[PDB]
Amino acid sequence: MIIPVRCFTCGKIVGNKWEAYLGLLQAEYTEGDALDALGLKRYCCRRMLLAHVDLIEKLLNYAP
Protein backbone atom coordinates (compact mmCIF):
# COMPACT_ATOMS: atom_id res chain seq x y z
CA MET A 1 0.00 0.00 0.00
CA ILE A 2 2.33 2.66 1.33
CA ILE A 3 6.09 2.29 1.91
CA PRO A 4 6.94 0.75 5.31
CA VAL A 5 8.69 3.06 7.73
CA ARG A 6 11.37 0.55 8.69
CA CYS A 7 12.86 -2.19 6.55
CA PHE A 8 11.49 -5.55 7.61
CA THR A 9 14.66 -7.58 8.12
CA CYS A 10 16.95 -5.00 9.78
CA GLY A 11 15.19 -1.87 10.81
CA LYS A 12 16.78 0.82 8.68
CA ILE A 13 14.46 3.78 8.23
CA VAL A 14 13.53 3.33 4.58
CA GLY A 15 10.24 5.23 4.74
CA ASN A 16 12.08 8.47 4.00
CA LYS A 17 13.59 7.08 0.79
CA TRP A 18 10.59 6.73 -1.48
CA GLU A 19 10.01 10.17 -3.00
CA ALA A 20 13.75 10.64 -3.44
CA TYR A 21 13.77 7.23 -5.14
CA LEU A 22 11.15 8.23 -7.68
CA GLY A 23 13.11 11.45 -8.16
CA LEU A 24 16.25 9.51 -9.02
CA LEU A 25 14.34 7.29 -11.39
CA GLN A 26 12.81 10.23 -13.25
CA ALA A 27 16.33 11.70 -13.57
CA GLU A 28 17.38 8.69 -15.73
CA TYR A 29 19.23 6.74 -13.07
CA THR A 30 18.97 2.98 -13.16
CA GLU A 31 17.51 1.01 -10.28
CA GLY A 32 20.91 -0.44 -9.53
CA ASP A 33 22.15 3.08 -8.87
CA ALA A 34 19.00 4.63 -7.45
CA LEU A 35 19.30 2.06 -4.67
CA ASP A 36 23.05 2.59 -4.45
CA ALA A 37 22.95 6.39 -4.22
CA LEU A 38 20.33 6.40 -1.47
CA GLY A 39 22.55 4.48 0.94
CA LEU A 40 20.83 1.09 0.71
CA LYS A 41 23.72 -1.36 0.90
CA ARG A 42 22.40 -4.72 2.11
CA TYR A 43 20.04 -6.55 -0.21
CA CYS A 44 17.42 -6.85 2.53
CA CYS A 45 16.88 -3.12 2.29
CA ARG A 46 17.22 -2.93 -1.49
CA ARG A 47 14.51 -5.61 -1.55
CA MET A 48 12.19 -3.20 0.25
CA LEU A 49 12.28 -0.34 -2.23
CA LEU A 50 12.88 -2.08 -5.55
CA ALA A 51 10.01 -4.53 -5.11
CA HIS A 52 7.53 -2.04 -3.68
CA VAL A 53 4.31 -1.41 -5.58
CA ASP A 54 2.97 1.89 -4.23
CA LEU A 55 -0.64 0.87 -4.20
CA ILE A 56 -2.12 4.05 -2.75
CA GLU A 57 -2.18 6.23 -5.85
CA LYS A 58 -4.56 3.70 -7.38
CA LEU A 59 -6.41 3.51 -4.10
CA LEU A 60 -6.98 7.26 -3.68
CA ASN A 61 -8.81 7.51 -7.03
CA TYR A 62 -11.96 6.35 -5.23
CA ALA A 63 -12.06 9.61 -3.27
CA PRO A 64 -15.13 11.43 -1.95
Binding site: G32, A34, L50
Partner: protein
Protein backbone atom coordinates in the same frame (compact mmCIF):
# COMPACT_ATOMS: atom_id res chain seq x y z
CA UNK B 1 3.88 -20.83 1.52
CA UNK B 2 6.31 -19.95 -1.19
CA UNK B 3 5.46 -20.05 -4.91
CA UNK B 4 6.75 -23.61 -5.24
CA UNK B 5 3.94 -25.18 -3.24
CA UNK B 6 5.76 -25.82 0.00
CA UNK B 7 3.52 -24.83 2.90
CA UNK B 8 5.04 -24.12 6.28
CA UNK B 9 3.07 -23.41 9.40
CA UNK B 10 4.42 -20.65 11.64
CA UNK B 11 5.84 -22.46 14.65
CA UNK B 12 7.78 -19.95 16.76
CA UNK B 13 8.67 -16.27 16.51
CA UNK B 14 12.39 -16.30 17.33
CA UNK B 15 13.89 -13.03 18.62
CA UNK B 16 16.15 -11.05 16.37
CA UNK B 17 19.31 -11.08 18.46
CA UNK B 18 19.12 -14.89 18.44
CA UNK B 19 18.96 -15.08 14.67
CA UNK B 20 22.10 -16.18 12.87
CA UNK B 21 23.37 -12.96 11.39
CA UNK B 22 25.36 -13.20 8.21
CA UNK B 23 28.75 -11.81 7.31
CA UNK B 24 27.10 -8.78 5.66
CA UNK B 25 25.23 -7.78 8.83
CA UNK B 26 21.86 -9.24 7.86
CA UNK B 27 19.73 -11.36 10.10
CA UNK B 28 17.40 -13.63 8.11
CA UNK B 29 13.70 -13.05 7.89
CA UNK B 30 12.24 -16.57 7.70
CA UNK B 31 14.16 -19.72 8.58
CA UNK B 32 13.34 -22.67 6.35
CA UNK B 33 14.32 -26.28 6.96
CA UNK B 34 16.65 -28.26 4.68
CA UNK B 35 14.31 -31.18 5.44
CA UNK B 36 11.46 -30.18 3.19
CA UNK B 37 13.62 -30.60 0.15
CA UNK B 38 14.75 -34.25 -0.39
CA UNK B 39 11.25 -35.73 -0.43
CA UNK B 40 9.58 -32.88 -2.33
CA UNK B 41 12.35 -32.00 -4.82
CA UNK B 42 11.59 -28.30 -5.26
CA UNK B 43 14.68 -27.29 -7.22
CA UNK B 44 12.63 -24.27 -8.28
CA UNK B 45 12.82 -22.90 -4.76
CA UNK B 46 16.62 -22.97 -4.75
CA UNK B 47 16.88 -21.21 -8.10
CA UNK B 48 14.28 -18.66 -6.94
CA UNK B 49 16.41 -18.08 -3.86
CA UNK B 50 19.58 -17.48 -5.89
CA UNK B 51 17.62 -15.38 -8.36
CA UNK B 52 15.90 -13.17 -5.80
CA UNK B 53 19.23 -12.56 -4.12
CA UNK B 54 20.85 -11.73 -7.44
CA UNK B 55 17.95 -9.46 -8.38
CA UNK B 56 17.87 -7.48 -5.15
CA UNK B 57 21.65 -7.04 -5.37
CA UNK B 58 21.41 -5.51 -8.85
CA UNK B 59 18.07 -3.76 -9.21
CA UNK B 60 17.09 -6.21 -11.94
CA UNK B 61 13.90 -8.25 -12.33
CA UNK B 62 14.55 -11.77 -13.52
CA UNK B 63 12.64 -13.92 -15.97
Amino acid sequence: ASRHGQKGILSRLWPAEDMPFTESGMVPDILFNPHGFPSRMTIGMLIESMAGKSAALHGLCHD
